[PDB]
Design a protein around this nucleic acid. Structure first.
Ligand SMILES: [Zn+2]
Ligand SMILES: [Zn+2]
Lengths: 108, 99, 82, 76, 94, 85, 148, 99, 83, 109, 93
DNA sequence: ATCGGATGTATATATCTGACACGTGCCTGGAGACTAGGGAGTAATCCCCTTGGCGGTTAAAACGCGGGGGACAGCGCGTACGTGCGTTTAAGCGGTGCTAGAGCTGTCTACGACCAATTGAGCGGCCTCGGCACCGGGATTCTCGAT
DNA sequence: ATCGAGAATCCCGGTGCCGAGGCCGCTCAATTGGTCGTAGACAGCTCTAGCACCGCTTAAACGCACGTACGCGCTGTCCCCCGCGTTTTAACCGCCAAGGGGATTACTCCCTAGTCTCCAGGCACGTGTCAGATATATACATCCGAT
C-alpha cells in the first residue's frame, strides 16, 4: 500500500483500524501488539457484520418493510445454521422465537 | 345452537398468534414489585433503573420459553400431549440446572 | 415491605408463555412449579447483580450490572449495551 | 552567496540569495526559478531544518553550503 | 458536560449502506449490532491472547488472530473469515 | 434459441465458460475467474455490485457452484473450443 | 498468459475505438509498462494543457488495479506534487469489469470537475472552495507555465 | 437340571460391579487406531504421544458414561427399562449438543 | 497407509460394559450404531482443535497438553494430565 | 507483623506469596497488582486445598487405605454438595462414578 | 534440563498438616496441581475483569474478595472470605 | 413359607516388588533498600432521574358451568434380548532396532515501544419530513354441525 | 366422500405522529516523524522416545441355541382442563413534585514499578524400603426350584 494515507482505507476496510489497535494494546491482552493483527481483526469484524446485516436486510425486504428491527435480526441469526451455532447462547432482546409446531400436535 | 369451538382448536390459534409477535407477556408492575422484594431480601434500600428491570424481564421470558419448549418435547416423548411437573423436573435435571 | 407477591405471576401469564413455547394442553400443577423455578432463577441472577452493584460502592442497580451477571452465568444478552 | 539544494527527485538547482535574506525569501526565489511551492518545502542544513521566519544569517550558511530538500506531501 | 462515548455506529451504518443502499436501521438494531461486534471482538482477542501466552511469546501477530478465528468460528464462516483476513493483510502490505 | 459463441465467452477473461457459477444477480462467469475474485477481489459481482457471500457459503457447502446444464450445452455445441485448453 | 492476452485485446479495442482528447500506447517492448497523454478540457481552466502520464501494470489485470502516475508535474486540487492520485475508482471501486478505456475516461472526467468531498491536499481544497476566480486563474498560470 | 440365573440378575450384578472398577473399558489398540485414522483424515503425517491418546480415551469414556446415564434416566421417565435410539437423540437435543 | 472401517474396533461388549457402568439394565439392539456415530462425532470435534493447536506451534507431534486445552476450550476440562 | 521472617511465614500460610505475586504480575491480568491481593488469594487457595485433602483423607480412611488415590478424590468431590456444584464440569482421571441404581430397576419383593 | 514449577511440596505440607499419617500418590499430585492452577486462573481472570469494568488499573484485595464471593457457592464463599480476611489482617500487622 | 444346592462374594495370610518418602548439590529466582510520579482517595457541586402520589378507563384477571377428549388402568401376544457354552481372533506383554523430531544454545537484525506536534475523523446537539402506527371498511379463508 | 352459516384473518385506503438521518460546531486522539532496546528467526547440535518389527500367551469377542418377559396395541372408564359468559379488580397512561445519588472537577498523597545487589528454597538426581497387588485357601450372603 502507498504510504501517507489513513489506515482504514489503506486495505479497503470500513471498520476502524486505529481504534482496534488501541483496544488491543490497552485491553490487557498482551505486552506487544503486532502491526497486522488489528487489520486482520478489523477485516473479520467487518465481514461478520456485513453478513449479518445482509441477511437482516433481506428478511426485512421480505417482510414488506424498509427498516431493520430486532425481529429481522433474530430471524436472520436463527435461520442460518452456521450463525445459529455461533450465537447459540445469546438471547436477542425483543426478537421472539421462530414459528414452529410439532407434527403430533396438529389436528387430525 | 351457539357456536362453540372444538376443545383444542383455538389453542393452536393462540400458539400461532404468540409465536409471531414479540411483546412482553408478564405484566410490568407485578414483576417489578417481585424483583424489588427479592432485592430488599438480599440488600436493603436499593433503587432499580428501569433498563435493568426490563433486561431482567427479557432474560426471564427467554429462559421460561426455552424451559417450556424442552418440557413440551419431553411430554411428546412420553406419548402424551399434556405437560406435567415430572417433565419440567426431567428437563431441568438433564440440562444440569439441578443435577 | 412486600409479602406473598409471587402470586403476581398469574395463571394467564404462564398460559401465554407456554402457548408461545409451543404447547397445546397444560396440566393443573404446572403453575406452582413454574413459579418456584422462576423464583430460583431471579434469586440466582439478583445475587450476582447486587454483588456487582455493591463492589462499585454504588446503590442503584443499573442495566450494565444485570447484563454482566447474565454474561457471567452463561446467558449473554444483547440490547442494553455491553 | 550561493547554496546547493538537492531534492528527492534528483534535481539539483542553484539559487542566488544573501545571508540576510529570510528563508521565506529563499523559498520565494526557489518558486520563481523552478516553481517549487514555498509552503511545501523542508530544507535541512547541518542536519537541522531551516525555519521560514528567520534568515540564512541566523543559520550561518556560507558559500558552497548544501541544503537537503525533502518534498512534503500532505494528506492521503 | 457529558463525557464522550465511543461506539461502532457509523461504521455499521456505512457497511449497511454498502450492502443495501435502500434500507434504514433502527436504534435498537444499532445497539444489538454494537453489542454483537464488541462480544465477537472480546472473544477473538481473549482466545488469541491465551494462545500467544501458550507458546511463551509476547507479540500478537496476524498468526494468533488467524488461529483464533479458525478455532472460534464454524467451518464455512472460519474459511471465509481467514480468506478475508489474508486478503486485507496482503492489500495492507503493498 | 441458442446463444452464439461470441456472447457466451466469459466477460472477464474473454474465454469460453469453464463450469460457471450462476449468481443470484443473474450473472455468469467462468469458475477460475470466480475463485480468483472470491480469493482476493472485493467479493462482489463485477457488474451490478452486489455481494454474494451468504449464497456462496450455502452453495459451497452443497458443492452446487457448477451449473451442469451450461457445461453440457457448451460441450455438445463446441467440443473443440473446450478441448483446446 | 491470461494477462498478456487481456492487455493485447485492450490495446486492440482502444486502437479500433480511439477515445476522446486522450491517447495512449506501449512506451517500450515490455507490454506491462504503458504511457499516455491527455489534453486539458476546453470547459476548464486547463486551456493549452498537455499532460504526460505513465501506467504500471501488475502481474494480473484486470484482476488487480493498475498503478497510474503523472510524469508531468501539474497542479490539481486532489493531486499531489509527485503525481499521487486519489481516485475512489482506483483503489475502492475497482472491479475486474473495468477496462483501461474506462479508467482513462473516468480520470479525464475527474480532471473536468474535481470532487472535493475527500480532498487530497486540504489547503488547495479550501482555496478552491473559498472562491472560484483566484483558483481558476492560478490553475491557468500553472497550466500555461508548465504544460506550455 | 442345570442352574441358570433368571434374566435380569446378572445385569444388576454387572452394574454393581463395574461401578466400582476404574480402568479403561475400551481396548487400547482399536481406540488408538481410530484416533490415528481421524487425525490422518484431517492432516497427514502426524505422531501421537501416548499421554494424548490416554487423555482422549478418558474423556471419551466419561462423555459416553454421562450420555448413557441421561439416556437411562429418560428411559425410566418414559415408563420403560430399555434404552432405544430415540432416547439417545432426545437426550442430545435436551443437552443442546445438536439443537 | 490409509485405514478403513476401523470404527468397528469399538466392539459390542465394550459399549455394553460402558452402559453397565452408566447404570443401565436392559439394552436394545440398535444402541450400538448410534453410540458409534456419537463417538465419531465427538472425536472429530476434539481432534480438530487438538490438531489446530499442535499445528500453530509449527510442531509435528500432538502432545497431551494440546488435547487437554482443546477439551478445556470445549468445556469438558480434564484433570490429571497436565495444565 | 514484626516483619522478620519470609512473606509466607509472616502471614502464617503455607502457599507461596512470591510465586503467586510473580504469576499475577507476569500473567497479563492488569497493569498494576496490589500488595495484599497475593496473600488473600494464597489464603483462599490453601483453604480450598485443605478442605478437599481433608475430605479425600477421610474417604480413604473409611476405605481402609493409607494413601489417596484418584478414586478417593472423585468420591470426596462427588459425595459433598458445594464441591460438586463447584466442580460439576470437571472430569477426574481414574475416578469412576458414584454407585447408585434407580429404585424402579431393583427386583420386586 | 529445565525447571518446572509446581505446587507439589506445598500441597504435601498441607496434607501432612491435616492428616499426619495418610500418603498421596503421583496421580493425586497431578490432579491437585491441575485443580490449584484452574482455581487460580479463574479467580485471577474474574478479578481482572472486575478491575477493567470499573475503569481501574490495579488488582487490590477487595477485587479478589468480590471475585471469590462471585465464584464459590455461599457457604464456601463465606468461609474463604473469612480466612482471607484473617490472613491479610495478620500479614498487615 | 423355607428348605437344600450352588454360585458368587467376602475374608484371613504369605510375599515381593516397584513406586513413594527422604538426603543432597546448587543456582536461578526470591528478598531487601531507595526514588518518582502517576493512580487513586477525598472534598465540593450539579442536575438526571427515581421514587412518590392522584385520577380515569378498560383491558385483563377471576369465577362458574357444561362436556368431551385424553390420562390411566387392565389383558393379551410374540418377538427381541438376557444367559450360557464352545470356538476363533487379536489384544497384551517382553525385547530390540532406528531415526525424525523435540528441546536447548549462540547471533543479530528488524519489528515494535515512547514522546512531540498536529490536525481531521468522530461525537454532542438540533431540526425536519417520511415511514410507520392506527382505524375503518371489505375481501378471503379455516371451522363445525348436518347432511 | 360434501354444502353452508358464523367467525377469525388478511388487503386496502386514509390520517396523523415522532424519531432517524443529515448538518454544524467543536475538542481530542490518531498520524507522522524519529530514536532505541530487545524478541525471536535462523542455523546448529544433542538425544528421547515414537514407530516398526517379532514372537508367545490366553483373555476377550463371537456365533448359536433356548427361554421368557415386557413393548406394544387394544379396550374401557372417568374426570379435569377448555371454551365461553359474566363480574370484579388493578394495569397503564397521564400528570405533578421533591431530593438523592450518579457524575464531574480539582487537589494532594503515598504505593508501587523499576533498579541493583545478595543469598537460600526448591528442583533434579539418586537411594532405601514397605503398602499393596497377587496368589491361595476358607466362611458366608444370596438366588432358584418346591413344596
Ligand atoms: Zn473468466
Ligand atoms: Zn451482479
Amino acid at each position: 500500500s502507498a504510504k501517507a494515507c489513513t489506515r482504514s482505507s489503506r486495505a479497503g476496510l470500513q471498520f476502524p483500524v486505529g481504534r482496534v489497535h488501541r483496544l488491543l494494546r490497552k485491553g490487557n491482552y498482551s505486552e506487544r501488539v503486532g502491526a497486522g493483527a488489528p487489520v486482520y481483526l478489523a477485516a473479520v469484524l467487518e465481514y461478520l457484520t456485513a453478513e449479518i446485516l445482509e441477511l437482516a436486510g433481506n428478511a426485512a425486504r421480505d417482510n414488506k418493510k424498509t427498516r431493520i428491527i430486532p425481529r429481522h435480526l433474530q430471524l436472520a441469526i436463527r435461520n442460518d445454521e452456521e450463525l445459529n451455532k455461533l450465537l447459540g447462547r445469546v438471547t436477542i432482546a425483543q426478537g421472539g422465537v421462530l414459528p414452529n409446531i410439532q407434527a403430533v400436535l396438529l389436528p387430525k | 345452537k351457539p357456536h362453540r369451538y372444538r376443545p383444542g382448536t383455538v389453542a393452536l390459534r393462540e400458539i400461532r398468534r404468540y409465536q409471531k409477535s414479540t411483546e412482553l407477556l408478564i405484566r410490568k408492575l407485578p414483576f417489578q414489585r417481585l424483583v424489588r422484594e427479592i432485592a430488599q431480601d438480599f440488600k436493603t434500600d436499593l433503587r432499580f433503573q428501569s433498563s435493568a428491570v426490563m433486561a431482567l424481564q427479557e432474560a426471564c421470558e427467554a429462559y421460561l420459553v426455552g424451559l417450556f419448549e424442552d418440557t413440551n418435547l419431553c411430554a411428546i416423548h412420553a406419548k402424551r400431549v399434556t405437560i406435567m411437573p415430572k417433565d419440567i423436573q426431567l428437563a431441568r435435571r438433564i440440562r444440569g440446572e439441578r443435577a | 415491605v412486600l409479602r406473598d407477591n409471587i402470586q403476581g405471576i398469574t395463571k394467564p401469564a404462564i398460559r401465554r408463555l407456554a402457548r408461545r413455547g409451543g404447547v397445546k394442553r397444560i396440566s393443573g400443577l404446572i403453575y406452582e412449579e413454574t413459579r418456584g423455578v422462576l423464583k430460583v432463577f431471579l434469586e440466582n441472577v439478583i445475587r450476582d447483580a447486587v454483588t456487582y452493584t455493591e463492589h462499585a460502592k454504588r446503590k442503584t442497580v443499573t442495566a450494565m450490572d444485570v447484563v454482566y451477571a447474565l454474561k457471567r452465568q452463561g446467558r449473554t444478552l444483547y440490547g442494553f449495551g455491553g | 552567496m550561493q547554496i546547493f539544494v538537492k531534492t528527492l527527485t534528483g534535481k539539483t538547482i542553484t539559487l542566488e540569495v544573501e545571508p540576510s535574506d529570510t528563508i521565506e525569501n529563499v523559498k520565494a526565489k526557489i518558486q520563481d526559478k523552478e516553481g517549487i511551492p514555498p509552503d511545501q518545502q523542508r530544507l535541512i542544513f547541518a542536519g537541522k531544518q531551516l525555519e521560514d521566519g528567520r534568515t540564512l544569517s541566523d543559520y550561518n550558511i556560507q558559500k558552497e553550503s548544501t541544503l537537503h530538500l525533502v518534498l512534503r506531501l500532505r494528506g492521503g | 458536560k457529558r463525557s464522550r462515548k465511543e461506539s461502532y455506529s457509523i461504521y455499521v451504518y456505512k457497511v449497511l449502506k454498502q450492502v443495501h443502499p435502500d434500507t434504514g436501521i433502527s436504534s435498537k438494531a444499532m445497539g444489538i449490532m454494537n453489542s454483537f461486534v464488541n462480544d465477537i471482538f472480546e472473544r477473538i482477542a481473549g482466545e488469541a491472547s491465551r494462545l500467544a501466552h501458550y507458546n511463551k511469546r509476547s507479540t500478537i501477530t496476524s498468526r494468533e488472530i488467524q488461529t483464533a478465528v479458525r478455532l472460534l468460528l464454524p467451518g464455512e464462516l472460519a474459511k471465509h473469515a481467514v480468506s478475508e483476513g489474508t486478503k486485507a493483510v496482503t492489500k495492507y502490505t503493498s | 434459441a441458442i446463444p452464439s459463441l461470441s456472447e457466451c465467452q466469459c466477460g472477464i477473461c474473454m474465454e469460453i465458460l469453464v463450469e460457471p457459477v450462476t449468481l443470484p444477480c443473474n450473472h455468469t462467469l467462468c469458475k477460475p475467474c470466480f475463485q480468483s475474485t472470491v480469493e482476493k477481489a472485493s467479493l462482489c459481482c463485477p457488474f451490478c455490485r452486489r455481494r454474494v457471500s451468504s449464497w456462496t457459503r450455502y452453495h459451497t457447502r452443497r458443492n452446487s457452484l457448477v451449473n451442469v446444464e451450461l457445461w453440457t450445452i457448451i460441450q455438445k455445441h463446441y467440443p473443440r473450443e473446450c478441448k483446446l485448453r | 498468459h491470461m494477462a498478456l492476452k487481456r492487455i493485447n485485446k485492450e490495446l486492440s479495442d482502444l486502437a479500433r475505438d480511439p477515445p476522446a482528447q486522450i491517447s495512449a500506447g506501449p512506451v517500450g517492448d515490455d507490454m506491462f509498462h504503458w504511457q499516455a497523454t491527455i489534453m486539458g478540457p476546453n470547459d476548464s481552466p486547463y486551456q493549452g494543457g498537455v499532460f504526460f502520464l505513465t501506467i504500471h501494470f501488475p502481474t494480473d489485470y484486470p484482476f488487480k488495479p493498475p498503478k497510474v502516475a503523472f510524469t508531468t508535474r501539474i497542479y490539481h486540487p486532489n493531486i499531489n506534487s509527485n503525481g499521487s492520485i486519489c481516485l475512489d475508482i482506483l483503489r475502492s471501486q475497482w472491479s475486474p469489469a473495468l477496462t483501461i478505456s474506462k479508467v482513462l475516461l473516468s480520470i479525464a472526467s475527474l480532471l473536468d470537475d474535481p470532487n472535493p468531498d475527500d480532498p487530497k491536499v486540504p489547503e488547495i481544497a479550501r482555496i478552491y472552495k473559498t472562491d472560484r476566480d483566484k483558483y481558476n486563474r492560478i490553475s491557468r498560470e500553472w497550466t500555461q507555465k508548465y504544460a506550455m
